[PDB]
């Protein structure tokens, strides 16, 4: 039932309408709290101002349609969110330049509103549109090994893109069921299926096959093609080796930890009162390996004798720890010194960054955790920290 | 004697000074031809306007320093030049918008001046620094096969980059001289050399070695690293399959052919008068394979009985061909139908695009020409057309 043009039209309508609604909400709040905007913006400005905003609005959708191509190619939720935030803050810079060259409060209100609402309302409209069933588009995976099934699992890791993997294909598939999906070996089925999207996930040793398929989908002019690997210049950015990144992470850690301490102090104090009925220290320090291999006392709610565990509140006192600098909010899970050997050659990756209360594996065996922590350390960004923190809050809620 | 800090400082100073000098030149020309700018821009504007320009200027260098990194990483002259034009035209949108919310002639004059002068004067500055010996930085190549020597030759293809290859390295090198350069097999020489840049050019079958070297340059913290190959998403853009690109190429071809006709009509008419002394057609049509395999009469100056060839003027009448659509300026060299077989599986690539007066191989055996033409067809851009046309004019001059 997949329908691309209706999706694009609805998404553009949502973008324009809600981008205008941000400024209208700013106007309404200013009127409700101050009662006079003619005080602030005289009347003859309005139309002029608003039409300028209209122009900006269409420019925004233009930058999202013909340059960033949000309406023809699909990205995960978080990459979309980061790109949209960068675009909209750059647009806020544009409008600040326009206004300064001609109010701060109305500008801040409108654009904070926009940042909050445009992605959330895009999510709402795409969810309703998925409920309408023209969002999910049918896809065929090529490959019958671990790479294909892992990519399939990655696709189900976030349904909001709408890739419905309907069937697999591999001329030499050992099984008939991959992840309980039908397997196609005679390619005539594939070509008779032609709005069918394709995902190439052949393994490295079969990469040559992909090259053949790289030609195949070109011959019948199939534009919906995507390949996921198992004179070019790739710059691997070791972000954790930058002093500016470390200082920014320290500042963000301090601010967020202080804020959440302010938020959750009553609950922690109530837990203190309830636990201290036995007469002992409700908070204990356990030795763990931290940054550079440094041994630190992690502070935790006491769980044993001289409900919290199910709710996972026992990790709350670590914020005091974060107040001193031993760990961040986002990072590898703390482990004992005996568990260090299981990292093997990745030990250096485990010791390069401060540990975190939450990490990639917490929200996504021991080797899987080690690989996820190493990937987080190698590809650390502040955006990744925000995403992992939001996912951790989501997990806590569910 | 290589010096990065002096080069960066000089390049920034040149960029800023000449960006301001563009506006000063616009002011001077407007004054010389009009005699009154107070007519146009009153006096109290000047300082305000100029300081805004000053701000824009530093913004420009900022956008070239911390975002585009033109001062720490080296790019080919044409990629640099295209990126600089894109930056300047985006800034043109900026400044035209800034003026709109508050003259067309002065703005156009000033920033055509900037567009012409900033790249050319930056080139003059880096050539002067090359004469001063702080531009060429010493580089070590890794690899002893065809890929290493090919990357070496492609590096000498643009000496303005500033990469002086001083020695090779390969533990298993068969020879002692690669391109007559010294070869190292004990890496202790390389680590004793440590401002030494590195170029990894190991072949695909030895790619594993590069991975080891990928670690090696990491452990000694050598940040001057570069690799040239012999979940990622690579979108191969077949530009020639786009109707908009084809129409743009048609319009550009028409305009450029018309202007070349306007410029070169006296020379062509004179050569007509000189050749027609024998009483025959100075212009002849030779059958050649064109777009889609279409056979077309290519127009050429007559060279045989019933100086021009040395000067290569005999290819001038093909402009008339370009006027009808069988020829472009930039494209594969026209060949006879017997030469088609030598393209082999690449024949389809030879037939997809209109033949041009000049091509990539003309300015850069038969197989090399076929590969260059196929690469041009696959990776065609209007910027590539401009670069090849400029290189062809350069070749004609030399």
Residue numbers in the entry:
A (entry chain B), B (entry chain A): 7 to 108, 113 to 204, 208 to 243, 262 to 337, 375 to 432, 438 to 471
Please give sentences taken from the publication describing this entry.
O-antigen biosynthesis in Salmonella enterica serovar Typhimurium LT2 is a well-studied example of a Wzx/Wzy-dependent pathway. This pathway utilizes a PGT known as WbaP (formerly RfbP) to catalyze the transfer of phospho-galactose from UDP-galactose to UndP, forming Und-PP-galactose. Finally, large monoPGTs (Lg-PGTs), which are the most abundant, include both a predicted transmembrane four-helix bundle and a domain of unknown function (DUF) N-terminal to the monoPGT core catalytic domain. The S. enterica WbaP is a prototypic Lg-PGT that has been biochemically characterized.
The structure presented represents the first monotopic PGT characterized in the native-like membrane of a liponanoparticle. Subsequent masked refinement and cleaning of particle stacks led to a moderate-resolution (~4.1 Å by GSFSC) reconstruction from 196,663 particles which was consistent with the AlphaFold model. Docking and real-space refinement led to the placement of 796 out of 1056 residues of the dimer. The dimer interface comprises ~780 Å2 of buried surface area, involving 7.1% of the residues of the protein. A modest (176 Å2) interface is found along the four TMH bundles, with the C-terminal half of helix 3 (Ile99 – Phe107) mediating contacts. While the C-terminal regions of helix 3 are within interacting distance, the N-termini (Pro82) are ~32 Å apart, creating a large void in the center of the dimer, which is presumably occupied by phospholipid. The catalytic domains of the Lg-PGT protrude away from the dimer interface, placing the two active sites 77 Å apart. A predicted helix-turn-helix motif from residues 337–369 of the catalytic domain is also disordered in the experimental map.
